[PDB]
């Protein structure tokens, strides 16, 4: 299965100047817990924002150009990225906007962190129809000394039905 994991501020904001316009350590733990020992697929710009491999996970970067870091696996297409993941139960797509756009139609699961911050972005999470998705998990947290905004984790599963001809 293909899953997307993303943190979204107000108005689907996910990025600004190749960074995330917030600081939420609590989201880091949620992200690790849900990606641990799973392959992670990311766009080149997201890779550049990280700057080093994510420990515990098979790192796959999509780029039209040669790779600039031998520690991760570089691919040049969506099908290639999926091919590189091999025979695993869950592929985690971790960003950014362009990559989310391409994978959302193929995904069966969304792991979302809703952040209560009204902040400007230049990158947004792709639009999707809420009627295609079923929320199966919520977990709310107030802001604290380490996290300046309240946030809520959510998991959604894609709605299926019987194929008819």
Ligand X SMILES: NC(=O)c1ccc[n+]([C@@H]2O[C@H](COP(=O)([O-])OP(=O)(O)OC[C@H]3O[C@@H](n4cnc5c(N)ncnc54)[C@H](OP(=O)(O)O)[C@@H]3O)[C@@H](O)[C@H]2O)c1
Binding-site ranges for ligand 25U (CB under 6 A):
5-7, 27-28, 31, 46, 49-50, 54, 94-95, 113
DSSP 2-30: EEEEEEE-GGGEEEBTTB-SS--HHHHHH
Nearer to ligand 25U, 37 or 87 (CB): 37
**Degrees (nearest 5) of the Cα angle 42, 9, 85?**
20
Instruction: Please choose which of ligand X, ligand 25U, none residue 44 contacts, taking the beta carbon within 5 to 8 angstroms, the exact cut-off set by kind.
Output: ligand X
Which DSSP letter does residue 142 get?
Answer: -
Nearer to ligand 25U, 45 or 75 (CB): 45
Where is 41: in which H helix or E strand?
Answer: strand 40-43
Instruction: Please choose which of ligand X, ligand 25U, none residue 28 contacts, taking the beta carbon within 5 to 8 angstroms, the exact cut-off set by kind.
Output: ligand 25U
List residues binding ligand X (CB under 6 A).
6-7, 14-15, 18-20, 43-46, 49, 62-65, 76-78, 94-99, 102, 123
Nearer to ligand 25U, 5 or 62 (CB): 5
Instruction: Please choose which of ligand 25U, ligand X, none residue 60 contacts, taking the beta carbon within 5 to 8 angstroms, the exact cut-off set by kind.
Output: none
Where is 47: in which H helix or E strand?
Answer: helix 44-50
Distances (CA, A) of 120 to 11, 27, 92, 117, 151: 9, 19, 26, 9, 17
Min separation Cβ 97 and ligand X, Å:
3
């Amino acid at each position: 299965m293909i899953s997307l994991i993303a943190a979204l501020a107000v108005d689907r904001v996910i990025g600004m100047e190749n960074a995330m316009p917030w600081n939420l350590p609590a989201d880091l733990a949620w992200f690790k817990r849900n990606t641990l020992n799973k392959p992670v697929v990311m766009g080149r710009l997201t890779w550049e924002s990280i700057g080093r491999p994510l420990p515990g996970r098979k790192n796959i970067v999509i780029s039209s150009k040669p790779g600039s870091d031998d520690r991760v696996q570089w691919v040049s297409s969506v099908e290639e990225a999926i091919a590189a993941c091999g025979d695993v139960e869950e592929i985690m797509v971790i960003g950014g906007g362009r990559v989310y756009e391409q994978f959302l139609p193929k995904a069966q699961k969304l792991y979302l962190t809703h952040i209560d911050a009204e902040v400007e972005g230049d990158t947004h999470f792709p639009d999707y129809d809420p009627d295609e998705w079923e929320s199966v998990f919520s977990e709310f947290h107030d802001a604290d000394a380490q996290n300046s905004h309240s946030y809520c984790f959510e998991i959604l599963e894609r709605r299926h039905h019987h194929h008819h001809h």
